[PDB]
Amino acid sequence: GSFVEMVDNLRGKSGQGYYVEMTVGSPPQTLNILVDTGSSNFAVGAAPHPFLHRYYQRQLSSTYRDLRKGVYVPYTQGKWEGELGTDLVSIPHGPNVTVRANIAAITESDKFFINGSNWEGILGLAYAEIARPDDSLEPFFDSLVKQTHVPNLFSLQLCGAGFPLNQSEVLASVGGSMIIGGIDHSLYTGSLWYTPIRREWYYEVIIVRVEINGQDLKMDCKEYNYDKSIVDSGTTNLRLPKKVFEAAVKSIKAASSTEKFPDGFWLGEQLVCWQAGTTPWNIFPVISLYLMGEVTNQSFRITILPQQYLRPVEDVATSQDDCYKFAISQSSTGTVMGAVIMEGFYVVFDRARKRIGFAVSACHVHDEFRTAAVEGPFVTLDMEDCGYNI
Ligand SMILES: CCC[C@H]1CN(Cc2ccc(CN3C(=N)N[C@](CCC4CCCCC4)(CC4CCCCC4)C3=O)cc2)C(=O)N1
Known part of the structure; x- marks a missing residue:
């Protein structure tokens, strides 16, 4: 095993999702994020919700950049809506790099967050073609690869x-x-x-x-x-x-x-x-x-x-x-x-x-x-x- 720093970095279960710890903003704000190979947006709770005990606070990040654009993502049994922006993102138990990535700050949602799942956002790992609002919003992994040697x-x-x-x-x-x-x-x-x-x-x-x-x-x-x-x-x-x-x-x-x-x-x-x-x-x-x-x-x-x-x-x-x-x-x-x-x-x-x-x-x-x-x-x-x- 040549990647010891990343081995055993996930938690969760099939019914509620597997998540990885990430940080967003400066100073870093720690959040648990669902690993989702079926979508392509990095979206995090950014406002109080009954099932969240923490969320991204843009006003506390010196590196937050507002894209002045909303995003609405309805899906099968629910939906999430938010405000787009960028910020510095890292994965503590991941590559030792920090990148500037798009972040959708979720302000309203329906049947998205899961009570007791322990995650506060989702990491869409698929391709830009299915990113919302459109393929111009570069997915996290694309940003990571473009900005580093990963x-x-x-x-x-x-x-x-x-x-x-x-x-x-x-x-x-x-x-x-x-x-x-x-x-x-x-x-x-x-x-x-x-x-x-x-x-x-x-x-x-x-x-x-x-x-x-x-x-x-x-x-x-x-x-x-x-x-x-x-x-x-x-x-x-x-x-x-x-x-x-x-x-x-x-x-x-x-x-x-x-x-x-x-x-x-x-x-x-x-x-x-x-x-x-x-x-x-x-x-x-x-x-x-x-x-x-x-x-x-x-x-x-x-x-x-x-x-x-x-x-x-x-x-x-x-x-x-x-x-x-x-x-x-x-x-x-x-x-x-x-x-x-x-x-x-x-x-x-x-x-x-x-x-x-x-x-x-x-x-x-x-x-x-x-x-x-x-x-x-x-x-x-x-x-x-x-x-x-x-
Ligand atoms: C984690 C386990 C949860 C339960 C719920 N549950 C049903 C279920 C139904 C459909 C999907 C497909 N799917 C997905 N992979 N990501 C989204 C956005 C797709 C995206 C595709 C491109 C266009 C925009 C939307 C958001 C989900 C991601 C998981 C959390 C909820 C929102 C989505 O709908 C996944 C799960 C299931 O089995 N276990």
């Missing part, structure tokens, strides 16, 4: 605990690593396999085959990427296009048929519980997503376990049972490889070479019989046809 690449190791963490525990536990400018070899086992970034807006990739316990879902592969497939640390679940979700759930139900679960469990709404230590991992199937490789007609696969797609949650009765929610859900906006999938792997966002790498994570949860995997190569033809075009 390589144009970052990598993420999100570590799920495999069991519920109470408030004190989640504040004291290490949730993973965000390595800025490099790859730390202590964070993964086996080899790294790369898939091309299809287009630079979201971190878009192409899935070419899907298996449930080795059985091919056998759908037209364009269905797997309708209308896109992205890697998003800001989403909790593995989200799949409606038809793919329906096919996958049918296959997962068939594989786990020795136990019957209520419809609410499969809808990802209700938890299922087992007596302490008796979770029947073995009856649930592994899921393999084959991704386009860097070589023509070549693919590789990433395989996750139920220890990744069953999200630990505390029982309504705080009992001693081990409980979980099904963390695979349907989408009308494409496939989303959320945090529960990322928890199985060390993911390298190699912006410089327009590719995303995957390797088995040194902190993935598993049992004595099965482990997550990243394997290849496999001969796969006409993979370009798996991409969807409007």
